[PDB]
Amino acid sequence: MNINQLILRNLKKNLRNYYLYVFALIFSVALYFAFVTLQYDPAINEVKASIKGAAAIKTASILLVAVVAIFILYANTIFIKRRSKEIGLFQLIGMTKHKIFRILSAENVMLYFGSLAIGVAAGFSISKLVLMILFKIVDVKADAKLHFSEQALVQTVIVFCGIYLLIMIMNYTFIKKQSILSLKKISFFQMLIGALGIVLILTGYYVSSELFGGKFKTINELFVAMSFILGSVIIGTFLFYKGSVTFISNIIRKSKGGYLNISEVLSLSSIMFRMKSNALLLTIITTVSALAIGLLSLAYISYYSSEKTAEQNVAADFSFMNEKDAKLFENKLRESNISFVKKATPVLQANVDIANIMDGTPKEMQGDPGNMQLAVVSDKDVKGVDVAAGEAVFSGYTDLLQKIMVFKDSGVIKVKSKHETQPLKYKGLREEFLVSYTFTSGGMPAVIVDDSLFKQLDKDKDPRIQLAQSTFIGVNVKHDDQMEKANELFQQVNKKNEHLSRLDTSAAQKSLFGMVMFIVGFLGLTFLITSGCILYFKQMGESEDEKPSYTILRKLGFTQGDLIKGIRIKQMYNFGIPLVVGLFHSYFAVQSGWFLFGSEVWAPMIMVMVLYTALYSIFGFLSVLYYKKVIKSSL
Amino acid sequence: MIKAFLIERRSWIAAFLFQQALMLFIAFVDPSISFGNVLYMVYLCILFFIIFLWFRYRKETAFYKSLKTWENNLDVTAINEPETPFEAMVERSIAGQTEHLKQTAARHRLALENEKDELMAWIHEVKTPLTAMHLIIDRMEEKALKSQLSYEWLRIHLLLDQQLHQKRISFIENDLSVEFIQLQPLIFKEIKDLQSWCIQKGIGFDIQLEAKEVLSDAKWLAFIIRQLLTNAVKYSEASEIEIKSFQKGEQTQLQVKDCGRGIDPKDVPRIFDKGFTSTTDHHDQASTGMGLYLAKKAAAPLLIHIDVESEFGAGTVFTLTFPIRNQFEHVISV
Amino acid sequence: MIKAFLIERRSWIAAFLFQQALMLFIAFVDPSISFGNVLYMVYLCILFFIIFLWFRYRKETAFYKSLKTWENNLDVTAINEPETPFEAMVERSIAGQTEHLKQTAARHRLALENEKDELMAWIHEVKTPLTAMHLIIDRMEEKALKSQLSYEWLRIHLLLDQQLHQKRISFIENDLSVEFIQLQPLIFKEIKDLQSWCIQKGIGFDIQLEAKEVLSDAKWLAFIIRQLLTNAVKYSEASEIEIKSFQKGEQTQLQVKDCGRGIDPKDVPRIFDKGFTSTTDHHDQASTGMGLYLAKKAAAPLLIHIDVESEFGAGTVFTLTFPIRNQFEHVISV
Amino acid sequence: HVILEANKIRKSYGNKLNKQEVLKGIDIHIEKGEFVSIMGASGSGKTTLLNVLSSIDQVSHGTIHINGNDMTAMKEKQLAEFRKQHLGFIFQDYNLLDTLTVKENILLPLSITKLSKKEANRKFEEVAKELGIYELRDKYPNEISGGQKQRTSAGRAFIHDPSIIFADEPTGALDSKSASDLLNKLSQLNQKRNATIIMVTHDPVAASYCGRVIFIKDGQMYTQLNKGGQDRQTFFQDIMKTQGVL
Amino acid sequence: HVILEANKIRKSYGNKLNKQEVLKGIDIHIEKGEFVSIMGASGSGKTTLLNVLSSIDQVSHGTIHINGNDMTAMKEKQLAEFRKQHLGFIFQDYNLLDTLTVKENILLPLSITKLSKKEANRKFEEVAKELGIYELRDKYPNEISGGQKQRTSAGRAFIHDPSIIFADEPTGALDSKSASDLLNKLSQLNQKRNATIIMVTHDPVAASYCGRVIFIKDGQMYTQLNKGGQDRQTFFQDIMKTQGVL
Ligand SMILES: Nc1ncnc2c1ncn2[C@@H]1O[C@H](COP(=O)(O)OP(=O)(O)OP(O)(O)=S)[C@@H](O)[C@H]1O
Ligand SMILES: Nc1ncnc2c1ncn2[C@@H]1O[C@H](COP(=O)(O)OP(=O)(O)OP(O)(O)=S)[C@@H](O)[C@H]1O
């Protein structure tokens, strides 16, 4: 007859088991098209940040294409595995390998391109909620419109055509390694490998605990610990997944004197002889999931720590540098009619010594001991803190600086002046900065002294570099009544925007960290769903590979309840081990990461972990249902 | 019984909640669309949904209660008149399958009855030629050839009479009859029809009939008596078969005692097995075995227990316990 | 079927679409909810609803389709395992309302084959003593009583052979055989089987045949030539039987020419109806007459075609037909 | 006595246009302690017969009475439980799980009753000594010869004290030496303790060891033989002649 | 002449620790046009011999030559081409595509040779008329009798005119009547077109239709018989008795 008719009938009466294939293809196409049309939309530039806005999406697409390609590659097994007896029979009749490959590739192309055509329409339907969420995160509200962005379609078509071109090679290889067909104990080395993996994981966690506990308080004692911890954790988890589960299962297996029933035989034998089979994949999944969760937590912390950081950079409510521009602003704020408390607070670069306030090692000397550019102020400007003679209080917390630069708790402040020295004691605490970040460079804690000491230091006039303007010109504002109008008037006065503002600087950080959080969350959710589905596919394959032990064990009359009980236990273990391992890795990766920053949060971790658990539970339940269906149709 | 309906109606509730959650989320994200009105009227929609749930519960669960009562009852009207196609399909399938089974059972029974009637017709119209055979054969003069021919003819005729009575035991239940028969003429008849056997084999007999009356259907009484007689002949040879009748117990016991081999004490409980054939004599295997079996089972109304006062060597007392003449009124009623 | 599913689930569709319509209508009239931005929400909700309906239909419409498949045709086991609460109901009801009929039919059929087996054993147990009686009667010397007794024996054993062949008809479905056979030895032995009737009635036989090839069973052809020849000699008196075969076309006319009375032309069409028997002769009650009807009912599967030309005062013409060498392949094909 | 009773067993395959009947009026009488072999052919109803008497498949018509119980009354679950607790099975091919030791594999069916540890060990040791595989106690079923796997399957069959042991041509995948060894072990096990065996086969050499041979022909049994008292050679020659008659 | 030839072909299975050798010195000289057979008990290395002779498997040691060529020193592409051109196959289990009718299912191997449809049409016409399955041309293989399916499978192996036909036991699923009919038609097709049908069976009356019965015991041939002029019955007697000798 005509081979085309054969292909048509084959597709028509075979397109009943290939639903997960089409669903996975549709999901991948929809997600990729949504992301790309978010990129090439011209309304994205409404955000305001340092980055171009559309620059990150190229890297995000580069990262996403590999994930979707791997997902489709691991999904192709559903289509390709069943065609074994047909290939054997076709070889028996006479048709060669190339004709069989072409016959299969025709149906593969038909299904693939049908699903690709369906996927584009679905993505355009949802390609407005993603944009709405993006606008909600960065808080820029103009509108939300639906556009097609043909370039996105071109890119998606090219990418997925390349992916199918790659799939063809796997199809050809599987067809190649087929023929006419019929149409181990444990050595002593495994003990060492398992013990080694366990001990490296334990010691990596332990040394990680000491790091953020307070030790390694020196710059050169940090990089070595980081690299050692990373390498030890990676190699330890790899050894765990390739010999530390067989070792830990053999103890229980031999504990009972060779006497098992159906539940233990199924569960223990499957786990012990199948977990070791694939080991590289599980390591990748767990490590990448932990890294993604940690990165998202870091981004959320950095985003939420925006108002305080902006207030730190912006000493007053509004900041000025140019005296002529300050005088102009003084003239043009009269029509603004706002209570201005602008002060010409004078500050002088007076040198002190903090070298003797080192509680770590004497080798930390930090540039100039007694000729630093530290700032001092009199007591008339600030009256909140009351300090007696011979005492002082540091003002500033500086987590990013606290991670390295640490002062002694009881280190007497020996002011190494040219001739004199003023011992100082720590009684109070303050955090009020009277200078902008432009003059403190890396960040110097504020020092408040008496007027007489300020006069003596300024009349000393040490030949040291001095700020361009001494009396910082910064103005405060009354109760929050006229914020927005003040912002636009200040924006329109500093057309060269060489000045500094609070409500303007407090938005670039929020926008940048919102973009980072969006990218990280989207990629992490996609990867997590894909990794959850790959294990379901593997379990379905292993179910298809274990049917004759259900044909037997049922003729002997074990019914189906016992078998399904054993399967439930097996699935519980198989989906519980990697989940717990990933949870522990994530907990010790997120923990290290607000110690470098400021205080703890504990807010998003619970939500991320509960979602992590829920998706794996769903996939495990689906796997149990598939196993039940396979067992029922055995005898 | 709410739980089952909730279990099978779970996807619709899941879809309802998912729709509410999705539209609430889109209302949250969109600033153009408000939030408070959406939340309030979602609450109103849920309160509206509850009453619809109750209504559909009542209707569908009431229908499934009627099929559950129909599951175990005696009235077919317990099912409601179908309104949805699914219930109509269920009821129609039930009715069709029940009707088909009834039809096939009736067809089997009628076919069996017709086969039995055909057998009765054939057996009568083939029995008549044997009467013709006897009439022709009772005229010869030769001795040895004619004697052995009489042997063969008697074997065939007794076979025929016996298993035609076995044919008629199928409807003996509606063919029962009782009347008074004196032993002497009918035992002389049983000697006469076996006079060929009596002359040939020369088996002795004795009639010490202390009680000289028995009761059963005339030809059925003859059947039972030469059943015992022919079983004794098959079992006893050249012995003084003491056919005595003294009433031991309630039943009028025909203490028919042969003087032959008798019944072995080890085999006394076994002689009452269905299809009894005394394998020690191969001529007894040709017997259908119903003889004792049908004698007992059609003697359940006749109340004739085949008692066995057997002693080996002196012969087995074939105690065919015809019940007392009073207990034969039970036989008359049935 | 899709229409039925939509009809039964109509209330839920109505509720969902009513909520969406209320969505749209309320959004249309209040400026706080921009009507232009609610079509998106309604579109998403309706897409989710249609996908969910597709899945739920696919899952739901399995068992009630299986029941409708098992409506009347066959396969009482075709009912699928229930998985929903309301499915575990119809299955149990069906089992409870069909087990009675199943057991009744099984018991009745079992009794049927038990009866047939008992009958067949009976008939063989009959056949043996008649064979012994023939073995002994093949020694006697008389003439007239010889004719009488031998004719009675012939009638008796042909009746028993007919009954054996009827019991064989009961399961004739498993004895088909096709091969090349010749007529001469068959006719010789069967003439040896038909001597005493010819001697008594003074009926001669003459054979002159053209085609001797027959392609059918052996024992059935023996019994069918018995049916035809015995019927002819029952209808022929003092006639030289001119049993001849002429290859007239595709059929070989085994014309049994007899110069006896024959059959009247007025009663020709009824000579092969239900249980036909020659009512002219009274003794034919001994003949079953079932032989003609069983010959009619069993002649179809064995490919023997009958032809008759009957006249009164000239005899009756009989004829059986045999197939060609290119015919015993349709028996596997057509 | 009369452990297996059958009355006109009927079985058919297919439906509508391709319905075929394979069992047509089969009657079986098996006594206690016998050793029965139903010789057949390639296309006769042997495997279907083994399925239908072992309550694996279902008979279209007829009634069976195994140990005095009505087999054709229970629906599925009672059938499975009765099959598990009272029948042992031996097959022609794969019977051993790939991922179990011999000891666990042939102690598996005893685990339901939960007979502690020591007595289970003693029973396993006693049984494994008889078949001569007790040395291969910790090896895996991919490291032993075929005859040893057959002996392992037989040991699993015999351990849990069954009533009727259903075999299906056990020696159909071995060489002559292992064939004779396995058959001799089966006969010795039957002699030591009363273990009925109802196996089907198509080889007179394998059935000469039996005590009674029934010949089946297209689902219709025909002729019987009895070993009686002659030695193996004479009974084998009798089976020779009887099979040659057909 | 001698269209099939073998010299000391040897084959062993297993690896390293476990090793078994089931073919030990086989020498066969099957002659062109002869309806040869191979007879022996199960598990004596029959299907392994069939696989080796057909280049399905590979030899440990030995040389097999067909029609002047060699088999042990060719690559996969040319081996497959030769298997197409000069080989035809039948196996115990029919392998028919339920997606197609009997018509195109039989015509499939000849539909890829770039030929006119009419030639294939009357070729199938002749094949079906010889096999007597012409009428079922337009019926799916899910509504026909088992013997008809088997004859369809057999007729598939004859359409492309193979020089040498192989077969496994082809009467393991048929009835007695169908088996006899199929063997008779195979015998008839022996001498119409000269094709060396090499059956492999373990059934005496099945091999009675052959003329070159060649026995096997455990991996080494024993005897050799010829039809001579016997009438298919005395040959059965001689074959079955010489089987009983072993
Ligand atoms: N679904 C089916 N499965 C198996 N056999 C079937 C099926 N339907 C019909 N059959 C027929 O049933 C027979 C199978 O063989 P059986 O009669 O059960 O015994 P068997 O032939 O001795 O089995 P083996 O393999 O030789 S032990 C063949 O005639 C098949 O055509
Ligand atoms: N991979 C294998 N392929 C074939 N036989 C194997 C294999 N591994 C082990 N064997 C054994 O090696 C022997 C080979 O026997 P076979 O060549 O199959 O002869 P056979 O069993 O008579 O042929 P069949 O299947 O009955 S037509 C058998 O005992 C098999 O169990």
> Cβ atoms within 10 A of the Cβ of B99, count?
11
Q: Which residues contact E86 (CB under 8 A, 6 or more apart)?
A: E66, E67, E162, E163, E164
Distance CA C79, CA C87 (A): 10
Residue E229, marked binder: no
Q: Does B30 touch chain A (CB under 8 A)?
A: yes
The whole-angstrom distance between C113's CA and the closest CA on chain D is 9
Query: Least CB-CB distance to E89: which of A13, A92, A95?
Result: A92
Distance CA A528, CA A523 (A): 8
Strands C251-257 and C213-215: unpaired
Protein residue with its CA nearest to atom 19 in ligand 2:
E45
| Single-letter amino acid code for the residue at C330 | H
Residue E42, marked binder: yes
Distance CA E91, CA A89 (A): 12
**Contact D110/A262 with Cβ under 8 angstroms?**
no
Indicate the DSSP class of residue B272. Answer: G
Q: In degrees rounded to 5, what are phi and psi of residue A119?
A: -65, -35
Q: Which residues contact C10 (CB under 8 A, 6 or more apart)?
A: none
* Cα A65 versus chain centre, distance: 18
Q: Could you tell me the CA-to-CA distances from C210 to C183, C204, C245, C251 in Å, in that order? A: 11, 20, 6, 11
Distance CA E172, CA C195 (A): 52
Distance CA A407, CA A398 (A): 12
> How far is the first Cα of chain E from the last one, in angstroms, to the nearest whole number?
32
Query: SS3 letters for chain D?
Result: CCCEEEEEEEEEECCHHHCEEEEEEECCEECCCCEEEEECCCCCCCHHHHHHHCCCCCCCEEEEEECCEECCCCCCHHHHHHHHHHEEECCCCCCCCCCCCHHHHHHHHHCCCCCCCHHHHHHHHHHHHHHCCCCCCCCCCCCCCHHHHHHHHHHHHHHCCCCEEEEECCCCCCCHHHHHHHHHHHHHHHHHCCCEEEEEECCHHHHCCCCEEEEECCCCEEEEEECCCCCHHHHHHHHHHHHHHC
Q: C with D: 3 or more CB pairs under 8 Å? A: yes
| Single-letter amino acid code for the residue at E233 | Q
Protein residue with its CA nearest to atom 25 in ligand 1:
D47
A616: its two tokens = 């794996």
Distance CA C133, CA C154 (A): 12
Task: Answer yes or no: is the C-beta of E92 below 6 A from any ligand 2 atom.
Answer: no
Entry field: residues in chain E: 246
Best probe of the C interface among D13, D19, D61, by most C CBs < 10 A, is: D61
Distance CA B278, CA B310 (A): 15
Residue to substitute in E10, E11, E18, E46 for testing ligand 2 pocket (most ligand atoms within 8 angstroms of CB): E46
Neighbours of chain D (3+ CB pairs under 8 A): A, C, E
Ligand 2 centroid–CA C16 distance in Å is 65
Distance CA D35, CA D212 (A): 7
Residue E228, marked binder: no
Residue E153, marked binder: no
Distance CA C45, CA A68 (A): 27
A80: its two tokens = 């390709």
Q: Could you tell me the CA-to-CA distances from A443 to A151, A366, A375, A393, C243 in Å, in that order? A: 47, 14, 11, 16, 138
**Contact A537/A76 with Cβ under 8 angstroms?**
no
Ligand 2 centroid–CA A424 distance in Å is 96
Distance CA C51, CA A509 (A): 42
E32: its two tokens = 């062109």
Q: Which H or E element spans position B132?
A: helix B85-137
Protein residue with its CA nearest to atom 7 in ligand 2:
E13
Indicate the DSSP class of residue B142. Answer: -
Q: Token pair 């020996």 is at which residue?
A: A414
Residue ranges of E 23-52 with Cβ closer than 8 A to chain C: none
Distance CA A426, CA A409 (A): 8
Distance CA C281, CA C236 (A): 12
Q: Does C333 touch chain E (CB under 8 A)?
A: yes
Dihedral of the alpha carbons of E78, E82, E88, E91, in degrees to the nearest 10: -30
Q: Which residues contact A388 (CB under 8 A, 6 or more apart)?
A: A427
Distance CA B148, CA A411 (A): 146
Distance CA B112, CA D159 (A): 50
* Cα A264 versus chain centre, distance: 39
CA quadruple B136, B138, B141, B144: dihedral sign: positive
Q: Which residues contact A520 (CB under 8 A, 6 or more apart)?
A: A292, A295, A296, A299
Task: Answer yes or no: is the C-beta of E45 below 6 A from any ligand 2 atom.
Answer: yes
Task: Answer yes or no: is the C-beta of E44 below 6 A from any ligand 2 atom.
Answer: yes
C11: its two tokens = 């209330």
Q: Which of B270, A94, D46, D43 is nearest to E174 (CA)?
A: D43
Q: B with E: 3 or more CB pairs under 8 Å? A: no
Q: Which of D182, D169, D144, D175 is nearest to D44 (CA)?
A: D169
Task: Answer yes or no: is the C-beta of D45 below 6 A from any ligand 1 atom.
Answer: yes
Ligand 1 centroid–CA D22 distance in Å is 8
**Directed axis angle between helix A129-138 and helix A20-39, to 10°?**
50
Residue E123, marked binder: no
Long-range contacts of residues C92-97, Cβ cutoff 8 Å, at least 24 apart: C92/B71, C93/B67, C93/B70, C93/B71, C93/B94, C94/B93, C94/B94, C94/B97, C96/B71, C96/B72, C97/B71, C97/B94, C97/B98
The per-residue DSSP string of A495-543 comes to TT--SEEHHHHHHHHHHHHHHHHHHHHHHHHHHHHHHHHHHHHHHHHHH
Query: Least CB-CB distance to A548: which of D94, D101, D107?
Result: D94
- Domain D4-245: which CATH number of 3.40.50.300, 3.40.190.10, 3.40.220.10, 1.10.10.10: 3.40.50.300
A141 with B31: Cβ contact below 8 A: yes
Task: Answer yes or no: is the C-beta of D219 below 6 A from any ligand 1 atom.
Answer: no
Phi-psi region of A411 (alpha: psi -120 to 50; beta: other; left: phi over 0): beta
Q: Which of E178, E173, E154 is nearest to E165 (CA)?
A: E154
Protein residue with its CA nearest to atom 9 in ligand 1:
D13
Q: Could you tell me the CA-to-CA distances from C300 to A95, A438, B71, C327, C329 in Å, in that order? A: 50, 117, 48, 15, 17
Q: Which of A84, A82, A85, A81 is nearest to A183 (CA)?
A: A85
A2: its two tokens = 């005509």
**HSE value, Cβ hemisphere, 13 Å, CA-based, for D143:** 12
> Cβ atoms within 10 A of the Cβ of D170, count?
24
Strands (DSSP E) contained in A356-412 are 375-377
The per-residue DSSP string of C248-315 comes to ETTEEEEEEE--S-B--GGGSTTTTSTT---TT-GGGGTS-SHHHHHHHHHHTTTT-EEEEEEEBTTE
Q: Coil, helix or strand for B246?
A: coil
* Cα A122 versus chain centre, distance: 28
* Cα A596 versus chain centre, distance: 16
Task: Answer yes or no: is the C-beta of D46 below 6 A from any ligand 1 atom.
Answer: yes
The per-residue DSSP string of E37-92 comes to EEE--TTSSSHHHHHHHTTSS--SEEEEEETT--STT--HHHHHHHHHHT-B---S
> Cβ atoms within 10 A of the Cβ of A282, count?
21
A128 with C43: Cβ contact below 8 A: no
Best probe of the E interface among A11, A84, A87, A93, by most E CBs < 10 A, is: A93
The per-residue DSSP string of C91-137 comes to HHHHHHHHHHHHHHHHHHHHHHHHHHHHHHHHHHHHHHHHHHHHHHH
A246: its two tokens = 């067989």
| Single-letter amino acid code for the residue at A251 | I
Residues of E in contact with D144 (CB under 8 A): 18
Residue B30 burial (C-beta neighbours within 10 Å; 0-12, 13-18, 19+)? buried
* Cα B302 versus chain centre, distance: 18
Residues facing residue D213 across a β-bridge: D37, D225
The per-residue DSSP string of A113-147 comes to HHHHHHHHHHHHHHTTHHHHHHHHHHT--S-----
Where helices occur in C138-218 by DSSP H, the ranges are 144-169, 183-192, 196-201
Go through chain A and list every residue after which a break occurs, taking a C to next N gap over 2.5 angstroms, comma-separated.
183
The whole-angstrom distance between B87's CA and the closest CA on chain C is 9
Count the helix, strand and coil residues of chain E and give each as a percent rounded to the nearest 5. 40, 15, 45
D3: its two tokens = 């452990």
CA A21, A25, A29: angle at the middle one, nearest 5?
175
* Cα E115 versus chain centre, distance: 27
B84: its two tokens = 């949805």
Q: Coil, helix or strand for A392?
A: coil
Residues of C in contact with B124 (CB under 8 A): none
**Contact B254/B241 with Cβ under 8 angstroms?**
no
Q: C with E: 3 or more CB pairs under 8 Å? A: yes
| Single-letter amino acid code for the residue at C56 | R
Task: Answer yes or no: is the C-beta of D142 below 6 A from any ligand 1 atom.
Answer: no
As annotated, the binding site of D includes 40-47
Distance CA C306, CA C320 (A): 5
A416: its two tokens = 């190494």
Dihedral of the alpha carbons of D173, D179, D185, D186, in degrees to the nearest 10: 60
From the alpha carbon of E200, which atom of ligand 2 is closest? 27
Residue E111, marked binder: no
Q: Could you tell me the CA-to-CA distances from A526 to A46, A67, E118 in Å, in that order? A: 26, 8, 58
Distance CA E243, CA E217 (A): 10
Residues facing residue B310 across a β-bridge: B316
Record the resolution, in angstroms.
Answer: 3.6
Distance CA A371, CA A310 (A): 30
The whole-angstrom distance between D171's CA and the closest CA on chain C is 35
Ligand 1 centroid–CA C27 distance in Å is 70
D63 with C74: Cβ contact below 8 A: no
A348: its two tokens = 């002088």
Distance CA D202, CA D168 (A): 10
C224: its two tokens = 């069918």
Distance CA D21, CA D10 (A): 8
**Contact B262/B313 with Cβ under 8 angstroms?**
yes
The whole-angstrom distance between A83's CA and the closest CA on chain E is 14
The whole-angstrom distance between A81's CA and the closest CA on chain C is 26
Residue ranges of A 124-183 with Cβ closer than 8 A to chain B: 129, 132-133, 136, 141, 144
Distance CA B236, CA B228 (A): 11
**HSE value, Cβ hemisphere, 13 Å, CA-based, for B49:** 19
Distance CA A312, CA A438 (A): 12
Where helices occur in A214-338 by DSSP H, the ranges are 223-240, 244-255, 262-274, 280-304, 307-313, 323-332
Q: In degrees rounded to 5, what are phi and psi of residue C306?
A: -100, 145
Q: Which of A358, A351, A360, A320 is nearest to A469 (CA)?
A: A320
* Cα C191 versus chain centre, distance: 33
Distance CA A180, CA A90 (A): 9
The whole-angstrom distance between C9's CA and the closest CA on chain B is 10
Residue E49 burial (C-beta neighbours within 10 Å; 0-12, 13-18, 19+)? buried
Strands (DSSP E) contained in chain E are 4-15, 18-26, 37-39, 61-66, 164-166, 196-198, 213-215
Q: Could you tell me the CA-to-CA distances from E22 to A341, C323, D92, E61 in Å, in that order? A: 106, 54, 18, 13
Entry field: residues in chain D: 246
Distance CA E203, CA E173 (A): 13
Q: Could you tell me the CA-to-CA distances from C157 to A331, A372, C161, C188 in Å, in that order? A: 147, 143, 6, 19
Instruction: Give the count of Cβ contacts less than 8 A between chain C and E.
Output: 6
Distance CA E29, CA C329 (A): 39
Q: Does E132 touch chain C (CB under 8 A)?
A: yes
Q: Token pair 């004697």 is at which residue?
A: B147
From the alpha carbon of D174, which atom of ligand 2 is closest? 29
**Contact D147/D181 with Cβ under 8 angstroms?**
yes
From the alpha carbon of D168, which atom of ligand 1 is closest? 27
Name the residue of chain A whose CA is nearest to B26's CA: A129
**HSE value, Cβ hemisphere, 13 Å, CA-based, for A505:** 21
Ligand that comes closest to the CA of residue D216: 1
The whole-angstrom distance between A562's CA and the closest CA on chain C is 18
A269 with D120: Cβ contact below 8 A: no
CATH superfamily for domain C156-333: Histidine kinase-like ATPase, C-terminal domain (3.30.565.10)
Residues of A in contact with B31 (CB under 8 A): 141
Residue B85 burial (C-beta neighbours within 10 Å; 0-12, 13-18, 19+)? middle
Q: Coil, helix or strand for A215?
A: coil
Distance CA A469, CA A593 (A): 39
CA quadruple A381, A387, A389, A395: dihedral sign: negative
**Contact E90/E142 with Cβ under 8 angstroms?**
no
Ligand 2 centroid–CA B6 distance in Å is 57
Residue E47, marked binder: yes
C298: its two tokens = 């069993």
**Contact B35/B27 with Cβ under 8 angstroms?**
yes
Distance CA B317, CA B310 (A): 5
